[PDB]
Structure formats: structure tokens, C-alpha cells
Amino acid sequence: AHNGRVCSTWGDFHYKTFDGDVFRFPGLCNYVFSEHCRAAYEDFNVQLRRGLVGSRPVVTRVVIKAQGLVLEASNGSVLINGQREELPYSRTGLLVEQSGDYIKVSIRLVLTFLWNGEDSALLELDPKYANQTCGLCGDFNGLPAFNEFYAHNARLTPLQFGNLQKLDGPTEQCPDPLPLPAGNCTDEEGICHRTLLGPAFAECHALVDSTAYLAACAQDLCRCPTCPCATFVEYSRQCAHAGGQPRNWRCPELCPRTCPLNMQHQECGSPCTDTCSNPQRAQLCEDHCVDGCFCPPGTVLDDITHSGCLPLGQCPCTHGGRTYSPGTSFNTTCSSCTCSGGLWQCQDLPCPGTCSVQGGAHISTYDEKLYDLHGDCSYVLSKKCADSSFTVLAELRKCGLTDNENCLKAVTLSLDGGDTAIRVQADGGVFLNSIYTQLPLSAANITLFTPSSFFIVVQTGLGLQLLVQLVPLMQVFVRLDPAHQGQMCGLCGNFNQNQADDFTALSGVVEATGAAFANTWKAQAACANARNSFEDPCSLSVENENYARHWCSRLTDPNSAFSRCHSIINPKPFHSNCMFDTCNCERSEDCLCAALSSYVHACAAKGVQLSDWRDGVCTKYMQNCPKSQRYAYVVDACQPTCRGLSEADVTCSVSFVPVDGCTCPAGTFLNDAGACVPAQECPCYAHGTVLAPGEVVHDEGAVCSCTGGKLSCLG
Amino acid sequence: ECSHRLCLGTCVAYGDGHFITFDGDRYSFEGSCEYILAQDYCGDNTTHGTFRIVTENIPCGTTGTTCSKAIKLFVESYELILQEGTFKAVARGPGGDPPYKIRYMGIFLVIETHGMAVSWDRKTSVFIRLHQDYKGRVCGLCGNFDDNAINDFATRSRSVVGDALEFGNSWKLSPSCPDALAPK
Numbered sequence: 001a002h003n004g005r006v007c008s009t010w011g012d013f014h015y016k017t018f019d020g021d022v023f024r025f026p027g028l029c030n031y032v033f034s035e036h037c038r039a040a041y042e043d044f045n046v047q048l049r050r051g052l053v054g055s056r057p058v059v060t061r062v063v064i065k066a067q068g069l070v071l072e073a074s075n076g077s078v079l080i081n082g083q084r085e086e087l088p089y090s091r092t093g094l095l096v097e098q099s100g101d102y103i104k105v106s107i108r109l110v111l112t113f114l115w116n117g118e119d120s121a122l123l124e125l126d127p128k129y130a131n132q133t134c135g136l137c138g139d140f141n142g143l144p145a146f147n148e149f150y151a152h153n154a155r156l157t158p159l160q161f162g163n164l165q166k167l168d169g170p171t172e173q174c175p176d177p178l179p180l181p182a183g184n185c186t187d188e189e190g191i192c193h194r195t196l197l198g199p200a201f202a203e204c205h206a207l208v209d210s211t212a213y214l215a216a217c218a219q220d221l222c223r224c225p226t227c228p229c230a231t232f233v234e235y236s237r238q239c240a241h242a243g244g245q246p247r248n249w250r251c252p253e254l255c256p257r258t259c260p261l262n263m264q265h266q267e268c269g270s271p272c273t274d275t276c277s278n279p280q281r282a283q284l285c286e287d288h289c290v291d292g293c294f295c296p297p298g299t300v301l302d303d304i305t306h307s308g309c310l311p312l313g314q315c316p317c318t319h320g321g322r323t324y325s326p327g328t329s330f331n332t333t334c335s336s337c338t339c340s341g342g343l344w345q346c347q348d349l350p351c352p353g354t355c356s357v358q359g360g361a362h363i364s365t366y367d368e369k370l371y372d373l374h375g376d377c378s379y380v381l382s383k384k385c386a387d388s389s390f391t392v393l394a395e396l397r398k399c400g401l402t403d404n405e406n407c408l409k410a411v412t413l414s415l416d417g418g419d420t421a422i423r424v425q426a427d428g429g430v431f432l433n434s435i436y437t438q439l440p441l442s443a444a445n446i447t448l449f450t451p452s453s454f455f456i457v458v459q460t461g462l463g464l465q466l467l468v469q470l471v472p473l474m475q476v477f478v479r480l481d482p483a484h485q486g487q488m489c490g491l492c493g494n495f496n497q498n499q500a501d502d503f504t505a506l507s508g509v510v511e512a513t514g515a516a517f518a519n520t521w522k523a524q525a526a527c528a529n530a531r532n533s534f535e536d537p538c539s540l541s542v543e544n545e546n547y548a549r550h551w552c553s554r555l556t557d558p559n560s561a562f563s564r565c566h567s568i569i570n571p572k573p574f575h576s577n578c579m580f581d582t583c584n585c586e587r588s589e590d591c592l593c594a595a596l597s598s599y600v601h602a603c604a605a606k607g608v609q610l611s612d613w614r615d616g617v618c619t620k621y622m623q624n625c626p627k628s629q630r631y632a633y634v635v636d637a638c639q640p641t642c643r644g645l646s647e648a649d650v651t652c653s654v655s656f657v658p659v660d661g662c663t664c665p666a667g668t669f670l671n672d673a674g675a676c677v678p679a680q681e682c683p684c685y686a687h688g689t690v691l692a693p694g695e696v697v698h699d700e701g702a703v704c705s706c707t708g709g710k711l712s713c714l715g
Numbered sequence: 716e717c718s719h720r721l722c723l724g725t726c727v728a729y730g731d732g733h734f735i736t737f738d739g740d741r742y743s744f745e746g747s748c749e750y751i752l753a754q755d756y757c758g759d760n761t762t763h764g765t766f767r768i769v770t771e772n773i774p775c776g777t778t779g780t781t782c783s784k785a786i787k788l789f790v791e792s793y794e795l796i797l798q799e800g801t802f803k804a805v806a807r808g809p810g811g812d813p814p815y816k817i818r819y820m821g822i823f824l825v826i827e828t829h830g831m832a833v834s835w836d837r838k839t840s841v842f843i844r845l846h847q848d849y850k851g852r853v854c855g856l857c858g859n860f861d862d863n864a865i866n867d868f869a870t871r872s873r874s875v876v877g878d879a880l881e882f883g884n885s886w887k888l889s890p891s892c893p894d895a896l897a898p899k
């Protein structure tokens with residue numbers, strides 16, 4: 001262990017070098033406590049300043065210089081490179097903490113400096129610094145009695161030795177301590193002998209000799225009689241550092257210590273206090289005994305709310321910075337996790353898988369393997385490749401000068417082995433079996449309707465739902481009842497919760513990149529193979545650069561509307577999509593707002609209602625609405641219609657993620673004419689007959705009324 | 716038609732903090748403390764597990780941007796610290812023969828354990844190759860090796876998060892260490 005890689009300074013100016021020496025040196029200036037001084041380039045330079053508190057010998061300032069880092073500890077405060085910092089302060093290779101009763105500065109592979117704050121200070125050094133250091137801590141050559149005190153072949157007294165390692169301030173001339181006259185007292189009552197030679201440090205007698213510590217205890221007895229326990233504390237530290245196990249020597253009279261209610265003050269407690277945040281940290285630790293507050297065995301520490309040491313099964317859990325007292329639960333969209341057993345017990349609610357094609361080029365599969373596809377053909381977007389039950393096709397078409405300028409142009413749901421084909425174009429035109437079909441339409445369990453002017457919903461009973469975006473451009477989203485898990489094929493991958501198998505082709509091997517995978521799923525053999533694209537279109541135009549940057553940066557802004565989803569969905573792929581689109585898109589605003597809409601819609605699929613994100617952006621999509629309609633951010637149901645309120649509707653029995661778009665406002669309905677009128681202006685419909693509002697009629701021996709669009713009949 | 720030989724899973728921890736876990740997921744995490752790059756010491760029983768790998772970012776001449784790594788290859792009761800350009804051995808437990816083997820593979824220190832081979836470029840990249848036996852029973856910053864990359868952001872309490880910072884902050888060895896802030 002830390003056999004001879006330790007030096008220390010304690011109590012009444014007692015200095016202990018690496019190799020085992022002890023001597024008193026009552027200096028009162030700055031001193032080179034240790035320094036890498038036999039190397040071409042120095043690694044550490046730790047200096048001490050020793051002063052008086054009324055009469056108590058203390059350390060008033062430590063200045064550790066290491067590898068370009070300056071660390072000045074004084075006045076209970078720490079200065080890191082000239083700036084005050086709040087404990088703990090951590091950086092690559094460096095960490096300073098208020099651990100336990102001290103201030104500990106560990107510069108990994110360099111040094112370990114403990115400073116109790118008043119009098120003690122201990123240095124652990126790497127083994128590679130042997131023979132290359134010089135200072136009060138010695139030379140680290142391993143030979144105690146022979147090489148610290150020979151200044152050009154002459155032996156020195158500890159006063160002279162400590163005076164050699166002196167360093168004045170720039171404008172300071174500190175004197176030297178004149179030798180202290182003879183001592184007195186000694187250990188008359190025998191306290192030093194009784195304790196140090198007592199049971200507690202038994203095995204410590206086998207590692208560290210107590211003679212100098214006995215002398216120092218007696219000498220401190222000559223000083224105040226509330227300060228003789230410094231030497232015992234130092235002997236405990238040294239015995240722990242050699243490897244031996246010190247035992248508890250403190251008694252309510254022998255410098256008693258106090259700890260919190262659940263925390264006991266121990267000598268030689270395990271340094272790594274298990275805490276149910278990491279309740280098994282103390283498993284395979286490597287660090288010797290350390291003194292301090294500890295917990296009774298079994299009840300690990302609670303560092304999450306600081307309720308003292310708590311039983312393993314009654315301490316909280318943490319999710320996203322939120323505290324959860326054990327017993328509580330939290331369900332995500334996809335899974336529910338209960339805080340119990342000191343952990344999160346997580347079960348999964350069934351989750352419909354979600355493929356999507358955004359920007360006409362980017363594809364997020366069911367396994368969430370985002371990849372780019374710059375192709376010009378019809379690609380089998382998804383297909384239950386056991387059978388031909390359903391086959392979602394997407395036609396991606398090149399839209400500009402560059403081969404990597406693509407737009408989605410159609411979504412052709414083939415069905416029943418090609419017997420049926422629902423083809424949603426990019427203008428919004430919907431073709432049922434290559435025949436124009438307005439919306440809604442409900443037949444063969446297939447339901448087509450527009451929740452708003454921006455989206456078209458193609459809901460089927462076979463399991464898959466298509467949600468297609470037209471504004472600002474053409475994007476597709478696909479939802480699957482999780483029953484089809486690990487069965488599908490096509491571009492969107494086999495939906496088996498594995499991102500490494502998504503590129504499984506029909507030949508039984510995982511394909512390498514996006515385009516190489518896609519060129520196996522082309523619909524027509526005459527298509528041209530997609531090509532891998534490295535050239536970022538962002539590099540072309542500086543004005544395109546600044547425009548795309550200044551707008552797409554709204555994604556990752558922690559103060560932005562999108563921040564609410566940052567802690568759930570990582571927005572880096574979405575920001576890359578926005579950059580690539582806007583830079584490559586001829587209609588930069590269109591692709592930009594398509595990217596922002598895509599991010600919003602994905603987050604709302606995960607279950608977050610991002611709202612009011614179009615501040616000063618994409619407002620031409622606010623204004624362009626059809627007359628008598630209006631925008632809405634949370635459209636989470638069917639469209640309120642006069643026919644529907646009159647006689648119900650199959651349309652409104654479909655659950656889809658809440659999309660945004662243009663709809664009639666609440667309290668209004670659109671008649672068969674499509675104009676938006678309140679309920680009072682739209683008629684009840686009986687047998688398909690327009691029965692005007694507020695009109696009493698006769699039918700089949702009955703009297704009926706049309707109140708607020710609602711039909712009532714009596715008799 | 717492919718031969719059916721099993722292939723070793725691969726975790727890659729390199730650069731300023733890029734990780735490619737066993738299940739193929741990729742992310743970036745700039746951590747400064749000691750982080751469990753792998754272990755079998757996670758389960759309803761921790762003690763039927765064998766090994767453990769921690770890493771942390773050494774600066775080699777300052778306290779600034781990272782310059783190298785520091786690995787702690789524990790194997791049962793043995794231990795191997797990889798730093799500064801070579802290896803060490805702080806074997807503390809039962810003193811039998813090494814359950815590891817050491818080799819100088821090109822510009823790499825390669826340490827095998829008959830089912831778990833660690834390759835260290837001697838500066839900053841670690842590539843770990845595991846047998847298919849350890850599938851689903853490991854954890855840390857190389858995921859849990861389950862061929863399910865979506866949930867590889869499983870923290871200490873197995874609360875799968877959508878954020879890299881929380882997943883990294885979970886696996887720090889010493890809870891006293893400060894959590895890394897937002898990477899820049």
C-alpha cells in the first residue's frame with residue numbers, strides 16, 4: 001500500500017518525511033513543503049505557510065502548483081488558477097473536495113493532498129517521483145536517516161534543514177525561528193504511553209514505530225492540554241497508510257468526536273461509503289482505512305436527499321433530476337418503472353412501432369436506426385415479408401440539380417396482395433385503386449380522413465396506420481400494432497428491437513450503409529441505384545449557412561420551446577436534418593419548417609405537447625389557412641362536423657398521435673359545403689335529408705326538432 | 716450461406732468521449748471522473764460476476780483537455796492499472812496464476828481473459844471484444860450487450876433515459892464526484 005509515499009505535517013510544527021523521519025521545526029514563513037526539483041520539467045510544487053492562531057500552530061495557506069494549475073487554499077477558501085471555486089471542483093485529472101473533515105486535492109497520477117483546515121496536511125505521491133523531489137518531505141529515495149540532512153557532506157539540525165527549504169515573498173523578509181530551549185513535562189501521567197502502546201494501535205506497532213510520536217505527544221502535552229490528540233490522530237493516519245488496521249481509541253474524554261444521527265465517527269472505516277445511489281461501491285474498492293463519519297452496516301448512505309444513512313429499501317430513486325420516494329411509480333409512453341428494491345423495477349407497456357420518412361431523404365426505422373437515403377425510385381417502405389398482407393410503398397423523386405436533392409412524392413399502400421392500392425400524392429390527392437377519392441372514406445375497414453389540412457390519416461384494420469404530412473412538404477409516418485414485432489421487412493426494418501439487424505437484406509446479411517441497403521428494395525429494376533453522399537450542401541453558400549444555422553439552432557437552445565423534449569429525445573439527429581435540409585433545399589423555409597414540424601411531431605409521439613414554437617418562424621403556415629378555418633397546435637381527434645354530430649361517425653374512432661394543423665375552432669362545425677358555421681347554422685340530417693336548424697317537422701307519426709344541430713324526436 | 720461461427724461483441728471507447736457500445740449504439744460523453752466501462756457486477760446477485768473495467772480521462776501534461784486514459788482491468792481478485800504507457804499489477808486477493816494474458820499487439824496493449832480481450836492503443840482508445848457468453852449480463856458504458864440498442868442508456872437503477880449525460884453520470888465510481896455539465 002502507501003508504504004513510503006507519504007509525508008505529513010501536524011500539531012506543533014511536526015514534520016514527517018517520506019522515508020520515516022520526524023522532526024519539529026517551528027518555522028513561520030512560506031516553505032517548499034515538496035517540489036519536483038530533480039527533473040528537466042517540474043510536475044508539482046506544493047508549499048506551506050505556517051502561522052499562529054492566538055497561540056495554536058496552524059497552516060494558513062497552501063499553494064500547490066502542478067502542471068500549469070495553481071491551487072491556493074487559505075481562509076477556508078480555495079482559489080483555482082486565481083478564481084474562487086465552490087467545492088467540489090473537478091476537471092480532467094484534478095478533483096478538489098470537502099470530503100469528510102478535510103479539504104482533499106487529488107491530481108491523478110501526481111499527488112494526493114489532504115488538509116484538515118487548521119494544522120494537519122498530508123501528501124501522497126506517485127512512486128515515479130522517487131529521488132526527484134526535494135523539500136521538507138525529503139527526497140523519496142527510501143533511506144530515512146542518511147540523505148535528508150547532508151548539505152554538501154555536512155549534517156544539519158532540523159532547524160537548519162527547515163531553514164534551507166525556505167522561500168520568501170517578493171517583498172517579504174521573514175526571520176528564522178530561534179531554537180526552542182529545553183523541554184519539560186514529558187509523559188508524567190503516562191497518557192501517551194498508555195494510549196499509543198495500548199490495544200488500539202497494536203498492529204500499528206508492527207508497521208510504524210511510535211518513538212517519535214511518543215516524544216511529540218509529550219511535547220504537545222507541554223503545550224495546551226486540549227491539543228495532545230494531534231499526534232494520536234497522525235499515528236492513526238500513518239498506521240492506516242502503511243496498511244495496518246487502526247482501532248478506535250477515542251473515548252468521550254480523549255478528544256471526543258461527533259457525527260450525524262445515523263452516522264458514527266469511526267477510525268478505519270471503509271473509504272467508499274456505500275450509498276443506495278451506488279449501493280455496492282464498497283465491493284471491490286482499493287483504499288486503506290480512513291477516519292470519518294460512516295454508517296452502521298446494512299444501511300447505506302442516502303446522497304439523494306441527505307436523510308442520513310437509510311435502509312436499502314426505503315431510500316429514494318432519481319429520474320431526470322426528479323426525486324421519487326420508494327413506493328412511487330412513473331410510466332413513460334413505452335414503459336412504467338416503480339421505485340423499489342433500491343432500484344427502478346421497469347415493466348413495458350406495449351408500444352406501437354413508428355417508422356417515418358422526413359425531408360424526403362431521412363428515414364427513422366422501427367428500430368430507430370436513423371439513416372439518409374438519396375434515391376430516385378419507388379422503395380418498399382415496409383412490408384410484412386412473411387405474406388403480402390400489406391405493402392407500404394414510397395416514391396422518392398429527385399427535386400433539383402444535385403443528385404442528393406430529393407422529395408417524397410407519393411405513398412402507395414398496396415393491400416391484399418395488390419388487390420387494393422391507396423395512393424396519397426404530394427398535393428393531397430388520394431387515389432383509391434387509381435381513382436380519385438375525396439376524404440373521408442370508410443370501406444373494407446379502411447378509414448381515410450384529414451385531422452387537419454396538414455395531415456392525412458389512412459387507418460387500416462390489418463394493423464398499420466399511415467399518417468402522411470403534406471404541409472410544408474411531403475413526409476410519411478407509419479404506426480404498427482406491436483403484434484407484428486420481428487416480422488416485417490422493407491426499408492423500415494424488421495421491427496425486432498435490434499439496431500444491428502435493420503440492414504438485413506433478403507440475402508441474409510446485414511448491409512453496410514443506407515444507400516447500399518436501399519438499393520436492394522427498389523420497386524423497379526430500371527431505377528438508378530442510390531449513392532452515398534458525403535458533401536454537405538451547407539458548405540456551398542455562406543448566406544444559406546447563416547440562415548440555416550440561425551434558424552435550425554432553435555432546436556438545441558435550452559431556453560427554446562423544444563427544450564421540454566430534450567430530456568427525452570436527443571435532438572442532434574433532428575438538428576442535422578434541419579441543417580442538411582435547409583442548406584440543400586431550394587425552398588429553405590419549407591424544409592426548415594418541415595424539420596421543425598418533424599421534431600415536434602416525434603416528441604408529441606413520445607408524449608410531450610410542444611406548443612408555440614413558431615415564434616417569428618414558419619408563420620406563413622399560420623396565415624395560408626383555408627378561409628373560415630384556423631391553426632391549432634394540439635389537434636388530437638377527428639374534425640368536428642355537422643354530419644358527425646347529427647348521426648355519429650366511424651372517422652372519430654381512430655387514435656392517432658396529436659398532430660397540428662388547420663381545423664375549425666371549437667364550438668364550430670363544417671357543413672357539407674365545408675364552410676365553418678356554429679352549431680345553430682348547421683342542420684340535423686335524418687335519412688340523409690337536410691333538416692334545417694330550429695325546425696319542427698312531422699315524420700311517421702312523430703314530431704321532431706333540430707336544436708343546435710342536434711336531432712330530437714317525440715311520440 | 717454463411718458459416719455459423721460466433722463473433723465477439725465489440726465496445727469502443729475513444730477520442731474526446733465517443734462510445735460505440737456492444738449493441739452498436741453510438742454517443743458522446745465528456746466525463747472527468749472514473750466511469751465503469753464494463754462489469755459483470757450488476758445483477759440480482761453481483762457476486763457471480765467476474766470482471767470490471769473502469770476508465771477516466773488523464774491529461775498528460777496539464778489539467779485541461781484529455782490526452783490519455785487510465786484503465787482499471789479488475790479480474791476477480793486481480794487488478795491491472797493501464798496508464799502512462801504501460802501496465803501494472805496490484806494483485807491483492809488470492810495469489811494463483813494470472814487469469815489474464817498480456818501481449819504487445821502492434822500499437823496496442825492486449826489483455827486477454829480467455830473470453831474477454833481488452834485492447835488499449837496506449838493513448839486514448841479502448842476496444843473491448845467479448846465472447847458471446849457474456850451476452851445480456853454486462854453493464855456500464857458499453858451497454859448491457861443485449862442486441863437491443865434503444866435501451867442501452869440504462870443507468871445504475873436501470874431507468875432507461877433518452878439522454879447521454881444522465882447515462883454517463885450514473886456510472887461514476889465515486890458519488891462524491893461532481894456530475895459532468897452539458898458537453899459543448
Ligand SMILES: *[C@@H]1O[C@H](CO)[C@@H](O)[C@H](O)[C@H]1NC(C)=O
Binds near residue numbers: 075076
Ligand atoms: C476567513 O474568511 C472569512 C470570510 O469568508 C473572514 O470573515 C474570516 O476572518 C477569515 N478567517 C477566518 C479564520 O475565518
Ligand SMILES: *[C@@H]1O[C@H](CO)[C@@H](O)[C@H](O)[C@H]1NC(C)=O
Binds near residue numbers: 130131141
Ligand atoms: C538517488 O539519487 C542519488 C543522487 O545522486 C543517486 O546517487 C542514487 O543512485 C539514486 N538512487 C535511486 C535508487 O534512484
Ligand SMILES: *[C@@H]1O[C@H](CO)[C@@H](O)[C@H](O)[C@H]1NC(C)=O
Binds near residue numbers: 329330331
Ligand atoms: C401513470 O402514473 C401516474 C402517476 O402515478 C398515474 O396517475 C397513472 O394512472 C399511471 N398510468 C396508468 C396506470 O396507466
Ligand SMILES: *[C@@H]1O[C@H](CO)[C@@H](O)[C@H](O)[C@H]1NC(C)=O
Binds near residue numbers: 443444445461
Ligand atoms: C373488414 O375485413 C373483413 C375481413 O376481410 C371483411 O370481411 C369485412 O367486410 C371488412 N369490413 C367490415 C366492416 O368488417
Ligand SMILES: *[C@@H]1O[C@H](CO)[C@@H](O)[C@H](O)[C@H]1NC(C)=O
Binds near residue numbers: 759760
Ligand atoms: C441472489 O439474489 C436473490 C435475491 O434476488 C437471493 O434470494 C439469493 O440468495 C442470492 N444468491 C446468492 C448466491 O447470493
Ligand SMILES: [Ca+2]
Binds near residue numbers: 140141143144145146
Ligand atoms: Ca533519504
Ligand SMILES: [Ca+2]
Binds near residue numbers: 367497501
Ligand atoms: Ca430491427
Ligand SMILES: [Ca+2]
Binds near residue numbers: 867
Ligand atoms: Ca440494450
